[PDB]
Amino acid sequence: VTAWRLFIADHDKPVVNVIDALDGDKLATFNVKGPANLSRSESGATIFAIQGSAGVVSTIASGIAFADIDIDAPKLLPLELTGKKPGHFVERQGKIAQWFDGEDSAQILGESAVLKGQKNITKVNVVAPHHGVAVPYDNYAVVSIPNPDDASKRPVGARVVDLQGKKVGDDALCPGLHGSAGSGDTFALSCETGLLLITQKNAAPVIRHLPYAKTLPEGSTSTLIGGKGMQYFIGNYGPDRIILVDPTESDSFRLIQLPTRRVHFVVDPVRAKFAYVFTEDGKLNQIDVLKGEISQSVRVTDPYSMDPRPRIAVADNKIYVTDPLKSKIIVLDATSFKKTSEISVEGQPFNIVAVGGSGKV
């Protein structure tokens, strides 16, 4: 049995739609408190709907878990996280860290408990409310350090804390810290001088700094995605360029110039040599990460000359591009890179995540 599902948040309405990615039919629509940004767990078993303006994070059991596969209907869980302006969500190996821009704490919990209907939260102090990020580790977390002076500015680095908020090592200064992603056993935080790279073995997590290569043009990264199946990061580097970073090689950086400005990007979790960038001209661009170049482009929507704009997700052998102003999802074959289908979604379909796979029953 093969099963994949899309989870789509409306830009304005407090709704999340669940769509069977394979035939387009609707599986559920969930009503939440506010418009949501969506994240999935690594296992794909839970979906989190972050509602910045409503002070809540809702949780969805996706209904697909695992090889052997167990398939149920998707369901809104009664577990909700509460706090002012929920922010960056980071999940790793079933450990969850939910940041709150308006709180003195981040909330750490575990996927296994969430799915069982349990809410077992550890609040870790982050010194001062700010727009930051928490990465969960075994018996530790990495949390951004709020800007001294103001604190409403971007954070100035990160540090290891134990789960009582106590600092462990020394601070890792990274001015203008913004942007985070995991790829394999390595987690990256971007800032004005480069990337913080985080790994954990059997002790405290270890942070090291990778400066932007001296050969790059002036610029820095403020958003990151992480490869799945091959270890790398993709960041923005100015509005019309991206950088590919290999954190395991000394020749770390490759710059790609886009023809027009970036709207969104995602990696391909199935064909790990590829990633995808959507640009304001309305094209989907295939990034061959090994060669460091755009290998092809295809027009998918009308231009969105830089509020809602398309978002990409990948499921099985298909790519899904939300077209909010046209109340639909465009579906392309990943291999041929051609449109094959469209799926209607009422309203302004915006953020999108996909889960699934295959297993015996």
Author numbering: 33 to 98, 105 to 344, 350 to 404
Show the paper's wording:
We have recently identified a periplasmic protein AztD in Paracoccus denitrificans, which is able to transfer zinc to the cluster A-I SBP AztC23. Two high-affinity zinc-binding sites are identified, only one of which is competent for transfer to AztC.
In the chain where these residues could be modeled, they were displaced from their positions in the holo structure. In contrast, very little structural perturbation occurs for ligands to site 1 when zinc is absent.
